[PDB]
Amino acid sequence: ELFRSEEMTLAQLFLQSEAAYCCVSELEELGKVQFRDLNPDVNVFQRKFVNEVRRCEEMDRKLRFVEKEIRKANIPIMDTGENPEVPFPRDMIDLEANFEKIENELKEINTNQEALKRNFLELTELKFILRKTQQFRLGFVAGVINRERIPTFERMLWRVCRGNVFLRQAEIENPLEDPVTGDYVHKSVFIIFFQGDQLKNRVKKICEGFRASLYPCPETPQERKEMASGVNTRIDDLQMVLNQTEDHRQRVLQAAAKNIRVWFIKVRKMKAIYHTLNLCNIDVTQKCLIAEVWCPVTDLDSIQFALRRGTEHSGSTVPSILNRMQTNQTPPTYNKTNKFTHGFQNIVDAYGIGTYREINPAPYTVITFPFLFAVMFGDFGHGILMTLFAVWMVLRESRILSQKNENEMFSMVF
């Protein structure tokens, strides 16, 4: 009865190594046991399950990477169903291969999509550059720039060359996308004509100075037709691959947006299980795990059931039975609670925690704290408003429970 802290038993168990994983998981689903740490020397390389935890740690990072890419694409995560722990057999390795498959597919497909999109946009610029240039020992260069740079660009050509350069700018029929920012900018083609290699270097240096995109071109309209056919071939090819590239990216992200909820639950459960298994120990000849726990006395049956369940879900017969201890330290203090009593327990616990079996202040607090607060705060109108808000929080509880945890003020009052 909650007038005092509930009865707890220190217990020891001999845990069969194959069943151990399943046992810990049933105990974590039961949620009524606290593990005593037997390893003061525990550390990243001293934890008995180094690889298993490291795999979980990396698998979580793989999930974070994939999830962030899906969220950046605004694709809805399914967040649906309730999932058990992964089994004791290392199916987690095949899951890790699936995680790598998705990760590597996204990295490769993103890299390719970016490169292909850049090439497609560059060839799109080249289509316009050739079409304008086709209207025309001399030399020349040709390219494209954002229109807003043309005044400074043209004046610098007339300054670096001592008043001598032929230039024709020409506007593009539509704006074109920036490969980095996605900004559609009103770019314009330019062609610059000169004589000799000295002028070639000046016009090129100024084009580089304004970051103008230069391109090669044939010397005559007739050869420019053959180049334009090559460009048409390459840009059409780029479109065909971009279509399937984007389609594949969409399939991969879509499949992953279902898998992530499942995989997250699985990985987080695995990490917790293995972290708990790292609290057990193994002496110089030992085979069965030594472990020790605190459990409520009422639930020694519930943990012994959970231990048997772990075995019955495993390739072994050993029930991993526990004993009560006698060399007992003072157990951790517990009280069962519900939606009403939890808050009233927290405002006591926040100041202090009773000794084992001590009287609990909380049941007296459930009324006495509201009473003293109401004596301090007593006003009919505020009493109504506070009542209305608290009622709203209860009647919309199912909706409200889905809301952001980051609003700690709202989380406190809720």
Partner: protein, 55 residues
């Protein structure tokens, strides 16, 4: 607890049995060169009897 004490004693006896088995079986492997002589002398005697029959 007496349970872990008794379990560790059985686990220690188990580790001793396999460690002693390794030493016994390693010593037995060294005997193979000495035991080989019993067959080697029979092959000598077989060839000797055949040789006398050929004479």
């Amino acid at each position: 607890s007496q349970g872990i004490q008794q379990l560790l004693q059985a686990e220690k006896r188990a580790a001793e049995k396999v460690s002693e088995a390794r030493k016994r079986k390693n010593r037995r492997l060294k005997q193979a060169k000495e035991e080989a002589q019993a067959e080697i002398e029979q092959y000598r005697l077989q060839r000797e009897k055949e040789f006398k029959a050929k004479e």
